[PDB]
């Protein structure tokens, strides 16, 4: 296993070429989220197009905070959502052709990786306990 990560800069009064305001950023963010875009995708879209560095350093607060602050928050965290729907897609594929024991092994690993952050999220209680795999 190796490293593949972004290295956010030492600057935090970013970025001094930013002509744009700090309210149109929040406007674009709520536009994209009520268009139905996950936090990662709204971040990358306004990173590329309406070029921000990151909204946590242009606005004073991260985008999950401003999504909750504008009443648009998710009901499950993004990672658990993506990993759940990956689990249901691999389950649908194995249900279609049940001989794929490699998909069985991968499904065991995917469900274990579900249970990891599931019990993490129960211990921190972002989504409430009694919760076990929808």
């Amino acid at each position: 296993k190796g490293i593949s990560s972004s290295a956010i800069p030492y600057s935090r009064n970013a970025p001094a070429w930013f002509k744009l305001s700090s309210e149109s950023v929040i406007e674009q963010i709520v536009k994209y989220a009520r268009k139905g875009l996950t936090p990662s995708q709204i971040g990358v879209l306004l990173r590329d197009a309406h070029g921000v560095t990151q909204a946590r350093v242009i606005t004073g607060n991260k985008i999950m905070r401003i999504l909750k602050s504008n009443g648009l928050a998710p009901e499950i965290p993004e990672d658990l959502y993506y990993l759940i729907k990956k689990a249901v897609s691999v389950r649908k594929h194995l249900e279609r052709n049940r001989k794929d024991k490699d998909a069985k092994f991968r499904l065991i690993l995917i469900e274990s990786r579900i249970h990891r952050l599931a019990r993490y999220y129960r211990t921190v209680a972002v989504l409430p306990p009694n919760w076990k795999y929808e």
């Binding site: 139905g36 875009l37 996950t38 928050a73 009901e75 959502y81």
Partner: peptide, 22 residues
Amino acid sequence: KKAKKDFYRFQVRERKKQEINQ
């Protein structure tokens, strides 16, 4: 393109309206 038909609480509002109207 990569919009979602899930994942948001206003989307659980629209789908509870769905699951009570149907």
